[PDB]
């Protein structure tokens, strides 16, 4: 047998309960609405309300539990509608079961927000609610990257237009062609193509691509020691100059803590004015541009 198919097991499961008709649906809807109002009234009467008479409390609690019963009965009734609807979409989505469950969520929404006084079979409203929920969940859970609904819709419209034009014309149209067809810009079309891209799988057969994936962002393995020696040389050169000049440069360019101190802060910490320090900075940088202080640093670019 090898009965490990949850699909067939679930179908066999949902085949147990019988399908219903319009008057039965009206009865169930009335029962659920009455049960909900009963629970609401009992909560209201439990808080600063009234000591519910034993018999009244009893039969209204019965009404509540029976409303829940009817809700569940209806959901069991229309599971088959869910599967029948879900069949069309499968082929471009996830596990069938996921779509079925989204359909069930749409059903509980529909049975929550159904009205019987309009005198209609429940099937249509159920259908629309189901489809809305399925499409929403499919979109939210389609790709490893998330693409919100309106952009999903324009992507689908672009795809349908391109496919029908391929069927009719026979050639793949152009970005300007799709821009004029969809009343949008060619750059927008290009962006929709770009965001339409789906990730490739690191796992493949060729071997796996993961083998040949150079780590362009990684240890350079030479610039590390290069920067170490660089810093050593800068400390040396700064020691060659005056200590005040060296400290001023270190604070100006953040060589001591990584925090770049500016003219007002350095003038404050040296007890002088920012123009004084600007003169200091200009003279020191002019001193540094003199090649004897720069022959040992020129090669570091």
């Amino acid at each position: 047998t090898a009965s490990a198919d949850s699909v067939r097991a679930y179908l066999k499961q949902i085949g147990k309960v019988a399908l219903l008709n319009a008057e039965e649906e009206v009865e169930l809807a009335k029962r659920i609405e009455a049960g909900l109002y009963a629970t609401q009234l009992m909560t209201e009467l439990s808080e600063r309300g009234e000591k519910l008479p034993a018999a009244q409390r009893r039969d209204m609690m019965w009404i509540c539990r029976d409303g829940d019963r009817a809700k569940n009965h209806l959901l069991e009734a229309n599971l088959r509608l869910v599967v029948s609807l879900a069949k069309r979409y499968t082929g471009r989505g996830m596990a069938f079961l996921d779509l079925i469950q989204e359909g069930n969520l749409g059903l509980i929404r529909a049975v929550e927000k159904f009205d019987y006084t309009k005198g209609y079979k429940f099937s249509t409203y159920a259908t629309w609610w189901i489809r809305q929920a399925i499409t929403r969940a499919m979109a939210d859970q389609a790709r490893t990257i998330r693409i919100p609904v309106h952009m999903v819709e324009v992507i689908n419209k672009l795809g349908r237009i391109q496919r029908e034009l391929l069927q009719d014309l026979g050639r793949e149209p152009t970005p300007e062609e799709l821009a004029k067809e969809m009343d949008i810009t060619p750059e927008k079309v290009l962006e929709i193509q770009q965001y339409a891209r789906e990730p490739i799988s690191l796992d493949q057969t060729i071997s796996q691509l993961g083998d040949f994936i150079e780590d362009s962002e990684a240890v350079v393995a030479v610039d590390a020691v290069s920067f170490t020696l660089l810093q050593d040389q800068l400390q040396s050169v700064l020691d060659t100059l005056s200590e005040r000049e060296a400290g001023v440069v270190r604070l100006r360019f953040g060589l001591t803590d990584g925090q770049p101190r500016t003219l007002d802060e350095i003038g404050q910490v040296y007890g002088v004015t920012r123009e004084r320090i600007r003169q200091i900075e200009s003279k020191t940088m002019s001193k540094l541009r003199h090649p004897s202080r720069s022959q040992v640093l020129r090669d570091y670019l």
Binding site: Q141, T144, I145, R146, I147, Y195
Partner: protein, 41 residues
């Protein structure tokens, strides 16, 4: 986690839920990876 060549035993063992949620640094609860537009997690 981080040590030196001090090694005498490699003990495998069946893990427990307290051990798992003590291992972890947070509770992932959303099925998303990267923002499609800015390419940030």
């Amino acid at each position: 986690m981080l040590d030196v060549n001090f090694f005498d035993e490699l003990r495998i063992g069946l893990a427990t839920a307290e051990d798992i949620r003590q291992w972890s640094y947070g509770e992932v609860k959303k099925p998303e990876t990267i923002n499609y537009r800015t390419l940030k997690p």
